[PDB]
Design a protein around this ligand. Sequence first.
Ligand SMILES: *[C@@H]1O[C@H](CO)[C@@H](O[C@@H]2O[C@H](CO)[C@@H](O[C@@H]3O[C@H](CO)[C@@H](O)[C@H](O)[C@@H]3O)[C@H](O)[C@H]2NC(C)=O)[C@H](O)[C@H]1NC(C)=O
Ligand SMILES: *[C@@H]1O[C@H](CO)[C@@H](O[C@@H]2O[C@H](CO)[C@@H](O[C@@H]3O[C@H](CO)[C@@H](O)[C@H](O)[C@@H]3O)[C@H](O)[C@H]2NC(C)=O)[C@H](O)[C@H]1NC(C)=O
Ligand code: CU
Ligand code: CU
Ligand code: CU
Ligand code: CU
Ligand code: K
Ligand code: NA
Length: 534
Amino acid sequence: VAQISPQYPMFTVPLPIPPVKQPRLTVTNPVNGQEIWYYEVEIKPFTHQVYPDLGSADLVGYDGMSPGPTFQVPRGVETVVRFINNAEAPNSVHLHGSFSRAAFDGWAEDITEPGSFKDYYYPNRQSARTLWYHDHAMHITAENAYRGQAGLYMLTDPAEDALNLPSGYGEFDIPMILTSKQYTANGNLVTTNGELNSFWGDVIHVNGQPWPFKNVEPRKYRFRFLDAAVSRSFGLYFADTDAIDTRLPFKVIASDSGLLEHPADTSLLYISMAERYEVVFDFSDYAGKTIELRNLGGSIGGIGTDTDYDNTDKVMRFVVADDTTQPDTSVVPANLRDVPFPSPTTNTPRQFRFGRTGPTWTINGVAFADVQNRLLANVPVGTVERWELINAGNGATHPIHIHLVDFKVISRTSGNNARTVMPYESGLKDVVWLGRRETVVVEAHYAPFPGVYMFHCHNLIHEDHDMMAAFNATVLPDYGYNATVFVDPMEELWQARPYELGEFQAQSGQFSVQAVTERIQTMAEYRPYAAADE
Ligand SMILES: *[C@@H]1O[C@H](CO)[C@@H](O[C@@H]2O[C@H](CO)[C@@H](O[C@@H]3O[C@H](CO)[C@@H](O)[C@H](O)[C@@H]3O)[C@H](O)[C@H]2NC(C)=O)[C@H](O)[C@H]1NC(C)=O
Ligand SMILES: *[C@@H]1O[C@H](CO)[C@@H](O[C@@H]2O[C@H](CO)[C@@H](O[C@@H]3O[C@H](CO)[C@@H](O)[C@H](O)[C@@H]3O)[C@H](O)[C@H]2NC(C)=O)[C@H](O)[C@H]1NC(C)=O
Ligand SMILES: [Cu+2]
Ligand SMILES: [Cu+2]
Ligand SMILES: [Cu+2]
Ligand SMILES: [Cu+2]
Ligand SMILES: [K+]
Ligand code: NA
């Protein structure tokens, strides 16, 4: 249907690459003698000139940019991030893909008010993967994410680096953060506020830029796809502009939780909100050609319900040079890793129905606001469970996300006989797309940390109104590991604290080296991640 947003100069602006975020300090952990990397991120308003001949757009971002800066963290290095609210509305930061403790996970009620900060303590122990950090504040997640609060967080491993995949952040390893928004006649954003169905957007962005281009050499690139959109799901394919409907082969090498067992040879990649897939595309057969990254129409080929607009079939263009300036020393091995699948279970699956209760998006008829009814499962730590995730309806779709865990996709059924499990769903995931009339069974090890955690649809409009619930990963009273201060996301020890902007700017008072060192060393003495030690 007709584009609503003003006409944009398609494929004229280079793909931006978010800068790498550097830590301010390293603090010695008195428990293990190891360095903890400490970072400061300032959430603040800013403007950006999106449309060259109109006015600017009003954004609110991590470090006053969108996307937020990219984290690059080696496995085995703990991190503390001080997220400072210098904005207009509350925030709650979630590191999506991290088995963080409950009070460091972005629980939707665990908010930071403007004029406060919160210290988040992250483990960085899981398999190498593409994580992302984003806002999660109750009922305002869609607008906070839409206006800029999302960024990438790469967890690295020298063992994965030994596979010799295309490498170098911004060189041959390229972030591909997808969003879908709508602009006013004078080039500002159309707010998501008021939307209760879905906010599709008619302008496709990569790394915050509408319909960009990038100059590439005729060789292999690693692309890290993230769907950070409010409500748009995608069916991605590549085509030569000389044959714009002919899909070009590529390889999927990783899903939400890390590498697949083997690369999946693919010409069409379904990707829904909060999913990450890493692709290697080989431009060597396309020297001197322009390759367009495109998006399926027909509501993602009948899997979705999304509205399609005049230019939502287009993502970006790659302009391929005639030769390389350096040899392509990269490869995609046929064997990537032994995926650490959970033990199979015989426990009858738990059922969760994603639908509506009057106008509200619900789980088993419950809204997250309903404190009394929203705790839908008690799961003893160490248990494996199958969850049967049911979309009975034809009128919407739901990418379901479970915090804490990685899971195996066991099965997909479709009431439209449309598809089953996709080859790139063969590994470990933390989001799974329930297309029209789809039921998916997932299998997860509820481990290794006890606490109250969220699960929800990741369509941010559904999520806010109000399709989210909780589970409790439970332990007995003789379980140790300081569990009594780590199970409750609202535990007073880990709450947000007020700050004065002068002290932040001067790096004085509670931002002094001495004050930060004492705070982080005190936090480290509680040993939040010890139950994951190997
Ligand atoms: C989620 O699960 C955790 C358990 O993994 C629940 O925490 C446990 O709650 C019980 C009952 O409140 C606590 O036992 C109580 O201890 C107090 C203090 O000694 C005592 O006065 C009571 O008679 C009772 O024995 C237990 O200590 C606590 N465990 C931990 C590790 O903190 C938690 O309540 C569940 N959360 C929700 C929201 O249901
Ligand atoms: C659970 O969390 C508590 C509280 O953070 C941990 O207890 C703390 O353990 C630290 C060691 O990191 C104790 O510090 C000690 O200070 C004394 C001097 O006062 C010094 O001689 C020792 O060498 C050490 O530095 C700290 O006092 C202690 N605090 C309390 C209130 O007990 C505890 O280890 C954690 N337990 C687990 C199972 O994680
Ligand atoms: Cu998320
Ligand atoms: Cu998450
Ligand atoms: Cu949904
Ligand atoms: Cu969540
Ligand atoms: K140090
Ligand atoms: Na595979």
